[PDB]
Ligand binder design. Structure first.
Ligand SMILES: OC[C@H]1O[C@H](O[C@H]2[C@H](O)[C@@H](O)[C@@H](O[C@H]3[C@H](O)[C@@H](O)[C@@H](O)O[C@@H]3CO)O[C@@H]2CO)[C@H](O)[C@@H](O)[C@@H]1O
Ligand SMILES: OC[C@H]1O[C@H](O[C@H]2[C@H](O)[C@@H](O)[C@@H](O[C@H]3[C@H](O)[C@@H](O)[C@H](O)O[C@@H]3CO)O[C@@H]2CO)[C@H](O)[C@@H](O)[C@@H]1O
Ligand SMILES: OC[C@H]1O[C@H](O[C@H]2[C@H](O)[C@@H](O)[C@@H](O)O[C@@H]2CO)[C@H](O)[C@@H](O)[C@@H]1O
Ligand SMILES: [Ca+2]
Ligand SMILES: [Ca+2]
Length: 686
């Protein structure tokens, strides 16, 4: 099947995601609606259930609301069973309508539907070429208090009906008892509870194995993607071992939520996106777009810096999921603001790099402050709004113009309020012009593009006051005026003759797993796939066509490789780097080193005899290690993903900048468990 097929679970760059808050979308089956003080059919009390369910989503997929909009993928609320308790926070009642208060990850939330309804959702969705993504929050269970075992459900966790434990009297140690986080540091936000939510302890083998078996159930139900909740609050080492469990079984596009505020650029956020096995929601992109198009606290020069910077910090910037708002932010559209601002933001996002995600109701101009006002029931299913049509015109372009799905980004014209960028991929080009100034037109002269000589009509058809572009020799565009609030999209598409890799997924897996390589110009007959210098051809290449290649990862040593293909004629393609081959199945192990004193700015790291530990290369050491919560300096600890059942040699080192100080003595040695977790405690050797 082609790279744009609905069956492509490893690539979402040609798709447009529609985020649905199940409960606030459509009540297709009133028979499963909660009752009593936990229900409000008028949906005036935004903290109780309103009735939205999966049957309702199915109806909206069948009457053409979503398909007519150009949507090709939906992201729904966590499907697992939540608590049934109505929590009272100072007078106001609260329900798990949002789906983030899990009690059993192997069952469904009755309010949304049964396992059967879920299967029908997958069938109905796929039938209309729509992929299904589920939210998954393995960081915690539900609101709990060790003091009030009566409060809510004490954060109790069940394994398909069978009770495993509660937050109070947690002798089994399923949860963390370190207090609550203040978001002061990364370590603090990971090992301490998020708000009043029972923080799960992934170092516990029962919890580790339980969550990995639970996710496999949903993979077998046929989901196409996964949005990991609060990935910023779980051990990165464990999450990497979790992504390996997913990728070594049934690979699916996964992205996590790492919240970033305005003007916040975190090096840790980047490192997590580059080597954890999953991508991330692009908060850096979302916050900047808000500053330039919504609040006007930054100009087009700041938007340009964000685009150029992110393309350098993210190894696979094309996997980051973009958006302009969500369930944790004020609706982009302010009730009194001009609508053209939301429209331009949509046009910008839909034609930019990454995977576009639209929050439900955006196309209907919904307004609303922070939670829960930003989660009101969608007011109507009208297709006559301007925003609906903008999405309708641009969404399909990610499927037919690979320049938008996999293309590079380049600034071709710019000033305070105007930005004209070009997307390019092979023989495909897309030029987008945006003028945020709603009161002043702009005289654009000196615009150069990669577009062939000729005339180009605005793809938006002038919907946002766009105009026709007249291009001469050398791609030099003829002078023209860009209307106030103007937005135009011009493009050119043609067959690509040279093999061009536009995407690869998964980006981390053990030998034997099949990966998907998408692009253009691969030819119709089998060629060769290279993992570094190792050539792969013949049977191990399960399928090969012009836009997609499926090949099994060769049994090579664990490490980082560059992917490269060649058609039957032997013409090589571009290189796609940062692909990681695991040493085998993974397990999460906690390393602890005692009496490792250091000087300010100097930190302790871990290195070892396997690729998962950097193969003795200080530049690839694991760390910095933690020393505040679970263990305190001079004792350091860190959760690492390592090959299961392998005997590993390792040493710790202190690093200040690129200056390394090795641990004395011989290597420490140990054999990782074949399953579950383990904790290695050793002393620093002088
Ligand atoms: O927690 C993260 C933090 O860890 C490391 O800091 C430790 C220092 O390396 C260690 O020397 C010690 O700090 C002492 C200072 O050296 C001393 O001058 C005086 O200020 O007392 C300090 C007592 O803490 O302990 C800290 C651990 O808190 C690492 O160097 C840091 O870069 C890192 O941010
Ligand atoms: O590079 C692969 C090897 O990496 C590791 O070797 C470390 C040692 O663990 C560490 O003690 C240090 O050894 C130095 C030694 O202390 C010093 O007396 C001598 O003069 O130089 C040695 C270094 O050349 O540094 C090395 C890394 O260079 C790992 O322990 C080992 O198993 C790997 O083969
Ligand atoms: O002409 C090539 C030139 O085009 C663009 O420069 C624009 C500039 O962005 C505008 O602010 C204004 O000054 O007109 C210029 C063209 O005359 C590109 O930004 C620039 O990189 C490129 O060299
Ligand atoms: Ca219902
Ligand atoms: Ca946590």
């Amino acid at each position: 099947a082609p790279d744009t097929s609905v069956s492509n679970k490893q690539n979402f760059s040609t798709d447009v995601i529609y985020q649905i808050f199940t409960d606030r979308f459509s009540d297709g089956n009133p028979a499963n609606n909660p009752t009593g003080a936990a229900f409000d059919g008028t949906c005036t009390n935004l903290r109780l259930y309103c009735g939205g369910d999966w049957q309702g989503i199915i109806n909206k997929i069948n009457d053409g609301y979503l398909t007519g909009m150009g949507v090709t993928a939906i992201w729904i609320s966590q499907p697992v069973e939540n608590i049934y308790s109505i929590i009272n926070y100072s007078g106001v009642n609260n329900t798990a309508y949002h789906g983030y208060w899990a009690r059993d990850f192997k069952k469904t939330n009755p309010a949304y539907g049964t396992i059967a309804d879920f299967q029908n959702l997958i069938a109905a969705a796929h039938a209309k070429n729509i992929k299904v993504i589920i939210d998954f929050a393995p960081n915690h269970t539900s609101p709990a208090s060790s003091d009030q075992p009566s409060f809510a459900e004490n954060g109790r966790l069940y394994d398909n009906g069978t009770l495993l434990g509660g937050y109070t009297n947690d002798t089994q140690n399923l949860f963390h008892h370190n207090g609550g986080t203040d978001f002061s540091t990364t370590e603090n936000g990971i090992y301490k509870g998020l708000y009043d939510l029972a923080d799960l302890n992934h170092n516990n083998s029962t919890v580790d194995v339980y969550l990995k078996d639970a996710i496999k159930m949903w993979l077998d139900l046929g989901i196409d993607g996964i949005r990991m909740d609060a990935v910023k609050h779980m051990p990165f080492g464990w999450q990497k071992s979790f992504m390996a469990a997913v990728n070594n079984y049934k690979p699916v596009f996964t992205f996590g939520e790492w919240f970033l505020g305005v003007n916040e650029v975190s090096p840790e956020n980047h490192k997590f996106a580059n080597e954890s096995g999953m991508s991330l929601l692009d908060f850096r992109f979302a916050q900047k777009v808000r500053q330039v198009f919504r609040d006007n606290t930054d100009n087009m020069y700041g938007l340009k810096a964000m685009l150029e910077g992110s393309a350098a910090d993210y190894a696979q910037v094309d996997d980051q999921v973009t958006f302009i708002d969500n369930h944790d932010m004020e609706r982009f559209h302010a009730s009194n603001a001009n609508r053209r601002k939301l429209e331009q933001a949509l046009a910008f996002t839909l034609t930019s790099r990454g995977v576009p995600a639209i929050y439900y109701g955006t196309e209907q101009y919904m307004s609303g402050g922070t939670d829960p006002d930003n989660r009101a029931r969608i007011p109507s299913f009208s297709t006559s709004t301007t925003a609906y049509q903008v999405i309708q015109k641009l969404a399909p372009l990610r499927k037919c113009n690979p320049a938008i799905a996999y293309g590079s980004t380049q600034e071709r014209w710019i000033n305070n309020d105007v930005l004209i960028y070009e997307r390019k991929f092979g023989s495909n080009v897309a030029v987008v012009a945006v003028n945020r100034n709603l009161n002043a037109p702009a005289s654009i002269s000196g615009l150069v593009t990669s577009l062939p000589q000729g005339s180009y009509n605005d793809v938006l058809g002038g919907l946002l006051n766009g105009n026709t572009l007249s291009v001469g020799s050398g791609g030099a565009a003829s002078n023209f005026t860009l209307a106030a609030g103007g937005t135009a999209v011009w493009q050119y598409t043609a067959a690509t003759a040279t093999p061009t890799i536009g995407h690869v997924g998964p980006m981390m897996a053990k030998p034997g797993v099949t990966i998907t390589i998408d692009g253009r110009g691969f030819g119709s007959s089998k060629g060769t796939v290279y993992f570094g210098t190792t050539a792969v051809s013949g049977a191990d290449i399960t399928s090969w066509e012009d836009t997609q290649i499926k090949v099994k990862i060769p049994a090579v040593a664990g490490g980082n490789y560059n992917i490269k293909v060649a058609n039957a004629a032997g013409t090589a393609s571009n290189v796609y780097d940062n692909f990681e081959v695991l040493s085998g199945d993974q397990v999460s192990v906690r390393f602890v080193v005692n009496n490792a004193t250091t000087a300010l700015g100097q930190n302790v790291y871990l290195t070892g005899s396997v690729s998962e530990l950097g193969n003795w290369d200080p530049a690839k050491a694991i760390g910095p290690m933690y020393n505040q919560v679970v263990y305190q300096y001079p004792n350091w600890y860190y959760d690492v993903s390592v090959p299961a059942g392998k005997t590993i040699e390792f040493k710790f080192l202190k690093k200040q900048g690129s200056t390394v100080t090795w641990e004395g003595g011989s290597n420490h040695t140990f054999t990782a468990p074949s399953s579950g977790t383990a904790t290695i405690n050793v002393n620093w050797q002088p």
